[PDB]
Design a protein around this ligand. Structure first.
Ligand SMILES: [Cl-]
Ligand SMILES: [Mg+2]
Length: 167
């Protein structure tokens, strides 16, 4: 009940961090709680008492990854546009035009506010350290992880960061 939603779309409001090594060659990824083999980035729900998205982003990066660092860029917003739960059993799932197909119009599940963080430390004891793994990946590896995880919005956020892409 401490969760915050868009007053317009009803999307859950979430913040998180693209956590880069100081040399900008790697990004910190974490395993999903539900799916141990899916690698994503730290992010979670804004809570009602939190004054800004940076606070949520750095809290969730601590809770989920045991990562501390400095926010160095605002990477703006991305949206989880996965269709609702009922979607694949509904009668009209797609809206087609002359040269294009789209999933039927729906609000986003989640609106993510992403920041780029420069990693200053990784701690062995952190709140979710027995529920998740946290590991550095090159850009090429991280991109494949996020496609494997079916989270293109997280890849959109990563691509806005200063991560070195030509591995
Ligand atoms: Cl909003
Ligand atoms: Mg979360």
């Amino acid at each position: 009940e401490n969760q915050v939603y868009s007053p317009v779309t009803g999307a859950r409001l979430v913040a998180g961090c693209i956590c880069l090594t100081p040399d900008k060659k790697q990004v910190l990824m974490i395993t999903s709680s539900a799916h141990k083999k899916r690698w994503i980035v730290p992010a979670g729900g804004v809570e009602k008492d939190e004054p800004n998205y940076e606070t949520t982003a750095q809290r969730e990066t601590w809770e989920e990854a045991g990562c501390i660092g400095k926010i160095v860029a605002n990477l703006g917003t991305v949206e989880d546009m996965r269709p609702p739960k009922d979607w694949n059993k509904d009668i009209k799932q797609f809206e087609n035009s002359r040269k294009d197909s789209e999933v039927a119009k729906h609000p986003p599940r989640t609106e993510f506010h992403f920041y780029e963080l420069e990693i200053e430390n990784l701690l062995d004891k952190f709140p979710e350290c027995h529920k998740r793994h946290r590991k550095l990946y090159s850009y090429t590896e991280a991109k494949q992880n996020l496609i494997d995880a079916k989270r293109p919005e997280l890849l959109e956020a990563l691509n806005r960061s200063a991560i070195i892409k030509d591995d």
